Amino acid sequence: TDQIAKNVKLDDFIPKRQSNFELSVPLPTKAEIQECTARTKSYIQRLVNAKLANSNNRASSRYVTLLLNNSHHIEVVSKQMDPLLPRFVGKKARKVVAPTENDEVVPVLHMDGSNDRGEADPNEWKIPAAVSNWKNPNGYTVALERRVGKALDNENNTINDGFMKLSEALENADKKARQ
Amino acid sequence: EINEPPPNICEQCLGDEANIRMTKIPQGSECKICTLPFTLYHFKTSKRSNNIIKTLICVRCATQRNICQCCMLDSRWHIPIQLRDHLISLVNEENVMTEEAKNDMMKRFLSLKNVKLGGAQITSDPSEADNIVDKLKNILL
Amino acid sequence: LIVNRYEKLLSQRPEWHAPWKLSRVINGHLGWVRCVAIDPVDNEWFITGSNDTTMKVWDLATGKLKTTLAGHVMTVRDVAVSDRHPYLFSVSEDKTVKCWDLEKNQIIRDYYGHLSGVRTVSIHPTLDLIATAGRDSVIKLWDMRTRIPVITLVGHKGPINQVQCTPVDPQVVSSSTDATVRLWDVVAGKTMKVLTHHKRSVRATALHPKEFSVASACTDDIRSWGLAEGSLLTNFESEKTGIINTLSINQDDVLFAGGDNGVLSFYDYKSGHKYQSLATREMVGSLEGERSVLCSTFDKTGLRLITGEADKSIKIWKQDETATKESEPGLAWNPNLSAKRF
Amino acid sequence: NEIVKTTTKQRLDAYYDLELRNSVMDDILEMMPESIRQKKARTILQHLSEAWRCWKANIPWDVPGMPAPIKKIIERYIKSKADAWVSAAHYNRERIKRGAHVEKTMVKKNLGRLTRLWIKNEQERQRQIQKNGP
Amino acid sequence: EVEVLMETKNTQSPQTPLVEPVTERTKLQ
Amino acid sequence: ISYDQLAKLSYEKTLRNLATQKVQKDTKTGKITIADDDKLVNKLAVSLQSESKKRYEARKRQMQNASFINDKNKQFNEKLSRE
Amino acid sequence: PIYVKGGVWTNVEDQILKAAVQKYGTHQWSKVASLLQKKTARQSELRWNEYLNPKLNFTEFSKEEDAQLLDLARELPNQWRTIADMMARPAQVCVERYNRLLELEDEEKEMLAEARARLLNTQGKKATRKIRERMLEESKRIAELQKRRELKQAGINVAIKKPKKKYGTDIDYNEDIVYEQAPMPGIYDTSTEDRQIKKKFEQFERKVNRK
Amino acid sequence: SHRPQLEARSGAKAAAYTPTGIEHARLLPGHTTLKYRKF
Amino acid sequence: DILDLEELREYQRRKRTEYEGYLKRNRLDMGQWIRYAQFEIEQHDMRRARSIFERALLVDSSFIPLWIRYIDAELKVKCINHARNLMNRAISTLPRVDKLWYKYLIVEESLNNVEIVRSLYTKWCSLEPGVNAWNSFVDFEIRQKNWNGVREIYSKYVMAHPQMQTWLKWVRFENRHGNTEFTRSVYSLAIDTVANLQNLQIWSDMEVAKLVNSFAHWEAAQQEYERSSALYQIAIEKWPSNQLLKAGLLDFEKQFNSIEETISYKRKMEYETILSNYDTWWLYLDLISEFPKQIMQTFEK
RNA sequence: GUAUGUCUAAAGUUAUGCUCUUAUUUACUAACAA
RNA sequence: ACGAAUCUCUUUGCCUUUUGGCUUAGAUCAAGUGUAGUAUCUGUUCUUU
Ligand SMILES: [Zn+2]
Ligand SMILES: [Zn+2]
């Protein structure tokens, strides 16, 4: 009752320009571009820093660009460890399968209904089971007609135009010589 | 990854000091549940207390069970997770378990999912917790 | 409700654009010209990536072979000059995303990481960060300076035929074979919104210059999408045309689409009106399937289309300056209504 | 465990060909209006492979039951592949002439390719001779 | 096509011989 | 025949198979308990099993109908011969 | 005895060759040759090309066809392969026609048995070995069961040994759910159904135990 | 037996995989600084 | 063979390991997935089956048969809410495929939750689906004994499919309906709509011609032929390019003058004749029928 | 002869037309001899 | 006779165990014995059916 497939709705199909052309989709604001850049740039710089200080090559350490656990308060610290022992004891290149986490459903939503051309076409589009003159993987024997083909040696006509003249010429030349 | 989630430690466990000084080793151990690197936090409860308390499980695991990261107890009631699941199963329902997969690959996978387990859904929202408590009380009498 | 919308459509008028003619032809490469990309700072030279792997740089004015560049092994599937900084990125089936420097004509930095033959590169307009995606079904994001992958926008469930980097929040438009397109909260590592209005491989996408939108292609339909909300904007009249290879939009709302039929399509980007079909020619010796425009891009001017066809030809197209509303009008636009999308 | 191997001289060909068949397969799926299964793509790609071999032989690849568009597409893709091959061969032979570092195996391969190429050329000349007199 | 206004070009060699850069290094004097 | 038509036509059929012979919502939980007839669901279960069984036996008969070497090839030549 | 190949095409042999051709196709002439203990690869291929291939023809030539032939002879002097092609016939036959116009079983059965055996055996050694291992494995399993069952009958309960896990993250699927991707969260309520199915499961287990 | 490529090794799994923390040869910092245009 | 419990457990394990292994190589072989799920079903462990289905779904959503199989599996164990929830989810994912919707519909019908089937049908129709959906809905709403609200959906069924076939179908329905007043009313409505959107923004001349014909024959069954005549005049007036229209009119005249019929019809035949090339026969016909200026002009031509 | 791959390596998890006899072939295999 | 249901067959529709890469066809087509095994041969006799 007004909830059956509440995720899908027709207004997603509706083109929002087909009604009203020159619906000026605003090219983003320069100020807001500065915002986005600032955010994302900050993020990626942090990420790269993390990547760098992570890695064992101390060489790449020089390109690196408090808390409370309730109402109760506490000081967090990072104890420096012996630079012999592994920096990150935890990480050991685990294989891990990802759960998808597609908790929200999303439609796949195409608008068409082709009957005449859509049914006449498959009779044309139906591809024959490809069989080779080279290589059976499964070793299926098959009919000899289906094996060997081409069947187009027939031509014979345009090829001859000139040969007649040539062989005839030879014959006549020979005749002339002979007599 | 970035240190996005904060550590999930309870009060009793942590001890009654206005300010303790704990340390964080990032990517600092595989957890006790899902064999998976996480930021290991640890601290002596007092300065001169000999026993360090280290954060056994990972934060995702903690959230998932809705527990302390050092006690392995529910963050609300400070009781064994299994026991709390039994209690929950008893009141309001017939069946509430929190099945950990005992296979090393699958456990990781399970840990990765951002989905609360049986009892954790009750104990997360405090309203629901309260409701459960009152129902339990009713059941008693 | 359909009748209302249809009526509204008929009420409006898609504007007249000057039609096109085949201005220049260049039989330059010895393979398909699967990539074409044009320098956006100066509008002087445009490079084209062959299947030979020798991406060749072409002056527009003369048309001559400015210079060859051959750092790759396999087909240079895509390239992308950064107007922001003088770096020609490219990418092959060899999984490399090599960054050339044009201040030296050599390669500078390779971006290792990609599991499978990467199809497309797109540089970020407002950052020193580039996006690339291939058969891996993953759109990676490289920090240029440090040549690491910063982030990996997993999501797509199939190879990812195009990508477009934008300046806004949805910083990436990822167009896949998976019959989808994605907009991403790049910082989050999450698709903010996922448009799916395609039956088939979404294998030709283009950002509009001055609109902040992105057209995408399927086997036939060519949607055009408004990527602020993550909303549809306009279905097109591509009902019988072929599989669209490339889809470069002009400055002046003149959306191009390249057919596997071979037929150059031409649309008014605002409306959808197919204001010119143009069946291309092949080179004398070619076969009739080979006439297939596999690449396309417009200049800064927007008055020269360049098309990387599989006839090993780099065909170029001018708009007719002799044209009027009576001398070559469009193809008499008509919304079909036959259970249609419009 | 994210090993991913680069292309090298040793695995270049295999990678090439897999990329090719992926492309071809994609194109055919785009074309095909029924939205057929992967198992029906096996027929397609296998068909392609046979076509390639036929081209190599210089026996015309004229399978009757196909749709024309598919036949076109495959013809195109083998022409691309063929182009790649022939040019590669030519490059190799100049390389061999130069006396460069080249794989014994690679030189044999090039010999084979160039032979097939030669035969193809030759019998094409025979055809030409036939088709428009001596 | 020898007749038409389509201008074909069967190019081969580079003009700039892989020395002359494609973009030039802007600087002080 | 498309999967559009073949769906509706099969829909029409099983409606003839039908032609042979309450909502309560807790909006806080979101749980829409549609208490309906347990006898009818059982009648669906048995009918649907019977439909699938009928189809299952239909193949079994058609498999037992009969230029090849092995089980698969015989069928593969049959896939060629139908064209 | 080993020897140099040749001889004459016995009809059985021809048939075998045809079968081979159907199997392996017209460009693996070595294999087909191998199938025939007497005849060579080259011989075989030639035979197929010349006599045996069904897309040839040996029907007589019409008067028009005769004219075409003899005219070709007149014009192309004894280039009979070319002439054959022109005709659309095999060459030897054409030549013969032109000329006309101008004027033991144990062994055979051995190769047959071997042949049929081969053609009906279409798998590389990897396959054969694999199926062998499969059946052997099955046998082993049943033997193990027989022991276990025997002991149960005897009164000693022995749990079946796990597969000696190949790697650290190797999975047993009976331990716990494979990769429990749960159903989509419930819009319609599911509680009674959960109960009923649980009961059914437990009941099934009970039945199995009793079974 | 030995089979063509169809569904590529998708970098979804490689993303969810744990880091290695090895130092490859080419990821050593080459051309630290970027160039820029006049604008 | 499969006697004791633990042994069965081992069997289950081994089988799983096989199935799992085969899935690992070809993540996509839905035949393999669905087979595995069938195995789970057979084992009478439903949860695992569900999980398998879910995984399978994730791997490839677009494969409809998988969805159907899962659905039916759910149905099998009388876990109807799960089936329903799933089917809703399927709809949400792939609404533009029909078989899912139909599967849902049949399920609900068998359930005899008729209100819900109406409601869902309303939804599906609202998404501008295929004509097929509309028709099936109508059949349902006719199989439902009532004849109100059906009217509204017919009105909407034009709204989604402005096709003359729709209108004609509606008219046919009203023919089944007892009250003839609405039949005429419907005709009036249709004609009015045609008038309003007169210009080239709908169906061809054919469909309109067909409509006019149908209307004319309805009226023919009814009393008022005056109005039919008026409509015809209006039709010729309102519409140009009246080959179909004129033909229909001619036919009606013949039914219900003779000279006129022979005249216009014959002329049409000449047009038809012209289209073929009996051109002599055409010209002659014209000459005889005529007007005589057009006879001699067209004769000259 | 090998790669390689399995196997073993000990402690008890608390439930009530045929059978036959032979001689011969051929094939394959054989780090067994010649 | 119309309506329906059940069963069998036939025609079509569905392909329902229905070919899953690349390279120089990826390359090259032999001179064996006795000893054993294994299978396959064939005869060979008799028995009883
Ligand atoms: Zn605690
Ligand atoms: Zn954990």
Alpha-carbon span I220 to I255, nearest angstrom:
10
Burial of A27 per CB tally in 10 Å (0-12, 13-18, 19+): middle
Q: How far is CA C132 from CA C78, C165, C320, D15, D77, in A?
A: 10, 10, 36, 19, 25
Paired sense of beta strands C20-26 and E7-9, if any: parallel
Count up the domains in chain F and report the number. Answer: 1
* 3-class DSSP assignment, residue D25: helix
Contact partners, residue A65, CB within 8 Å, separation at least 6: A45, A48, A49
Which DSSP category does B54 fall into? E
- Amino acid whose CA is nearest the C1' of K22: D14
Picking from I18, I24, I43, I54 by the largest number of G CB atoms within 10 A of its own CB, the best residue to mutate is I54
Tokens of D55: 């081209």
Tokens of B80: 């064994």
The structure tokens 């080249």 sit at D102
Query: Domain range holding F39?
Result: 1-83
Give a three-class secondary structure readout of chain C: CHHHHHHHHHHCCCCCCCCEEEEEEECCCCCCCCEEEECCCCCCEEEEECCCCCEEEEECCCCCEEEEECCCCCCEEEEEECCCCCEEEEEECCCCCEEEECCCCEEEEECCCCCCCEEEEEECCCCCEEEEEECCCCEEEEECCCCEEEEEECCCCCCCCEEEECCCCEEEEEECCCCCEEEEECCCCEEEEEECCCCCCCCCEEECCCCCCEEECCCCCCCEEECCCCEEEECCCCCCCCCECCCCCCCCCEEEEEECCCCEEEEECCCCCEEEEECCCCCCCCCCCCCCEEEEEECCCCCEEEEEECCCCEEEEEECCCCCCCCCCCCCCCCCCCCCCC
- Bases of chain K below 7 A from a protein C-beta are 4-7, 9, 13-32, 40-41
Query: Do I92 and A13 make contact, defined as CB atoms within 8 angstroms?
Result: no
Alpha-carbon span C308 to C46, nearest angstrom:
11
Q: How far is CA I176 from CA D16, G157, I172, in A?
A: 67, 76, 7
Where are chain C's structural domains?
Answer: 1-342
Contact D49, D80 (CB under 8 A): no
User: Quick one: fold of C1-342?
Assistant: Methylamine Dehydrogenase; Chain H (2.130.10)
A13 touching C, CB under 8 A? yes
Cα B19-B21-B27 angle, rounded to 5 deg: 135
Cα I163-I166-I167 angle, rounded to 5 deg: 95
Alpha-carbon span G23 to G4, nearest angstrom:
26
Query: How was this structure obtained?
Result: cryo-EM
- Tell me which long-range contacts B111-115 makes (C-beta under 8 A, separation of at least 24): B111/B31, B111/B33, B111/B34, B111/B36, B111/B58, B111/B60, B111/B61, B111/B64, B112/A96, B112/A98, B112/A99, B112/B60, B112/H16, B113/A99, B113/A101, B113/B64, B114/A101, B114/B60, B114/B63, B115/B64, B115/G182
Alpha-carbon span B73 to B60, nearest angstrom:
15
Burial B116-129 (b: 16+ CB within 10 A, else e): bbbbbebbeeeeeb
Burial B18-28 (b: 16+ CB within 10 A, else e): eebebbbbbbb
Residues around ligand 1, an ion, CB closer than 5 A: B 10, 13, 68, 70-71
- CA neighbor of G74 nearest in space, from A152, A176, A174: A174
Torsion of CA I70, I73, I75, I78, to 10 degrees: -130
List the C35-38 sheet strands across, edge first. Answer: C35-38, C45-49, C55-59, C65-69
Alpha-carbon span I123 to C151, nearest angstrom:
41
Q: Determine how many CB atoms are found less than 10 A away from the CB of residue D70.
A: 22
Alpha-carbon span G35 to G39, nearest angstrom:
9
Name C106's bridge partners: C101
Q: How far is CA I117 from CA A4, A31, I81, in A?
A: 10, 52, 15
Alpha-carbon span B43 to B51, nearest angstrom:
9
| Ligand number, closest to the Cα atom of B70 | 1
Contact partners, residue C34, CB within 8 Å, separation at least 6: C49, C50, C51, C75, C76, C77, C78, C294, C295, C308
Could you tell me the distance in Å between the CA of residue G114 and the C1' of nucleotide K39?
13
Query: Do F76 and A119 make contact, defined as CB atoms within 8 angstroms?
Result: no
**Orientation of helix I292-300 relative to helix I279-289, angle to 10°:** 160
Any alpha helices (H) in chain I, and if so which ranges? 5-25, 30-43, 46-59, 64-76, 80-93, 98-111, 114-126, 131-143, 150-160, 164-176, 180-196, 205-221, 225-238, 243-255, 258-276, 279-289, 292-300
Picking from I201, I203, I207 by the largest number of C CB atoms within 10 A of its own CB, the best residue to mutate is I201
Which DSSP category does B67 fall into? B
Of A23, A28, A111, the CB nearest to C341: A111
- CA neighbor of D17 nearest in space, from D80, D62, D63: D80
The structure tokens 């090039």 sit at D110
Alpha-carbon span C9 to G21, nearest angstrom:
65
Contact partners, residue C74, CB within 8 Å, separation at least 6: C53, C92, C93, C94, C117, D7, D12, D15, D16, D19
The structure tokens 């292994």 sit at I21
| Residues of chain A neighbouring G187 (CB-CB closer than 8 A) | 3
Query: Do G163 and I17 make contact, defined as CB atoms within 8 angstroms?
Result: yes
Could you tell me the distance in Å between the CA of residue G2 and the C1' of nucleotide J32?
25
The structure tokens 């504007």 sit at C15
Contact C105, C67 (CB under 8 A): yes
Amino acid letter for position I285 = L
Residue G159: its H or E element:
none
Report yes or no on chains A and B touching (3+ CB pairs under 8 A). Answer: yes
Burial of A76 per CB tally in 10 Å (0-12, 13-18, 19+): middle
Which of the other chains make 3 or more beta carbon contacts under 8 angstroms with chain G? A, B, F, H, I
Q: Is the CB of D109 under 7 A from strand K?
A: yes
- Amino acid whose CA is nearest the C1' of K42: G106
Tokens of C337: 């209504």
Query: Do B112 and H16 make contact, defined as CB atoms within 8 angstroms?
Result: yes
Query: Do E10 and C21 make contact, defined as CB atoms within 8 angstroms?
Result: no
H19 touching A, CB under 8 A? yes
H6 touching I, CB under 8 A? yes
Contact G184, I46 (CB under 8 A): no
Distance from CA of I24 to the nearest CA of H (A): 12
- CA neighbor of A103 nearest in space, from A7, A12, A1, A13: A7
Could you tell me the distance in Å between the CA of residue B100 and the C1' of nucleotide J13?
22
- Bases of chain J below 7 A from a protein C-beta are 6-8, 15, 26
| Ligand number, closest to the Cα atom of B78 | 1
Contact partners, residue C190, CB within 8 Å, separation at least 6: C155, C184
Alpha-carbon span I155 to I150, nearest angstrom:
9
Residue ranges of E strands in chain A = 74-77
End-to-end CA distance of chain I: 95
**If you measure from the C-alpha of residue B83 to the centroid of ligand 1, how many angstroms do you get, rounded to a whole number?**
16
Contact partners, residue C14, CB within 8 Å, separation at least 6: A21, C268, C270, C271, C272, C273, C275, C330, C333
Compute chain D's Rg from CA coordinates: 18
Alpha-carbon span C59 to C42, nearest angstrom:
11
| Residues of chain I neighbouring C198 (CB-CB closer than 8 A) | none
Q: Determine how many CB atoms are found less than 10 A away from the CB of residue I299.
A: 14
Find, in chain C, the residue whose alpha carbon is nearest to that of D32: C219
Q: Determine how many CB atoms are found less than 10 A away from the CB of residue F80.
A: 17
Contact G94, G80 (CB under 8 A): yes
* 3-class DSSP assignment, residue I113: coil
Task: Count the alpha carbons within 13 Å of F30 in the hemisphere toward its beta carbon.
Answer: 5
Which DSSP category does A63 fall into? G
| Residues of chain I neighbouring F48 (CB-CB closer than 8 A) | 72, 75-76
Could you tell me the distance in Å between the CA of residue F1 and the C1' of nucleotide K1?
35
Q: Is the CB of G110 under 7 A from strand J?
A: yes
Contact C119, C77 (CB under 8 A): yes
- CA neighbor of C185 nearest in space, from C153, C211, C158: C153
- CA neighbor of H38 nearest in space, from E21, E26, C101: E26
Residue A47: its H or E element:
helix A30-54
- Amino acid whose CA is nearest the C1' of K16: F59
Alpha-carbon span A112 to C336, nearest angstrom:
13
Find, in chain I, the residue whose alpha carbon is nearest to that of C4: I159
Alpha-carbon span G84 to G91, nearest angstrom:
5
Q: Is the CB of G174 under 7 A from strand J?
A: no
Of B95, B100, B105, the CB nearest to G169: B105
Alpha-carbon span C68 to C45, nearest angstrom:
12
Q: Is the CB of I180 under 7 A from strand K?
A: no
- CA neighbor of G190 nearest in space, from I46, I121, B91, B124: I46
Contact partners, residue A170, CB within 8 Å, separation at least 6: none
Contact C125, A36 (CB under 8 A): no
Q: How far is CA D133 from the centre of its chain?
A: 32
Name B43's bridge partners: B53
| Residues of chain E neighbouring C105 (CB-CB closer than 8 A) | 18-19, 21-22
Q: How far is CA F76 from the centre of its chain?
A: 26
* 3-class DSSP assignment, residue F21: coil
Alpha-carbon span C314 to C34, nearest angstrom:
10
Could you tell me the distance in Å between the CA of residue C94 and the C1' of nucleotide J4?
33
**Orientation of helix I150-160 relative to helix I131-143, angle to 10°:** 170
Contact partners, residue I198, CB within 8 Å, separation at least 6: I238
The structure tokens 């909502």 sit at F23
Tokens of C204: 């030709």
Cα D44-D49-D53 angle, rounded to 5 deg: 145
Contact C19, C28 (CB under 8 A): no
**Resolution value, angstrom units:** 3.8
Name B20's bridge partners: A74
Burial of G156 per CB tally in 10 Å (0-12, 13-18, 19+): exposed
The structure tokens 């109402």 sit at A71
Q: How far is CA H15 from CA A59, B99, C174, F45, in A?
A: 26, 27, 17, 43
Amino acid letter for position G52 = L
Alpha-carbon span C257 to C243, nearest angstrom:
9
The structure tokens 């050339």 sit at C100
Burial C125-156 (b: 16+ CB within 10 A, else e): bbbbbbbbbbbbbbbbbbbbbbbbbbbbbbbb
Contact A127, D47 (CB under 8 A): yes
Name C183's bridge partners: C173, C193
Tokens of A107: 């439609």
**If you measure from the C-alpha of residue A78 to the centroid of ligand 2, how many angstroms do you get, rounded to a whole number?**
21
Where are chain B's structural domains?
Answer: 3-141
Contact C123, C97 (CB under 8 A): no
* 3-class DSSP assignment, residue I225: helix
DSSP string, D111-123: HHHHHHHHHHHHH
Q: Is the CB of G48 under 7 A from strand K?
A: no
Which DSSP category does G2 fall into? -
- CA neighbor of C97 nearest in space, from C148, C57, C137: C148
Q: How far is CA C181 from CA A14, C82, C133, C162, in A?
A: 17, 24, 13, 9
Tokens of C232: 């549809």
Alpha-carbon span C155 to C133, nearest angstrom:
12
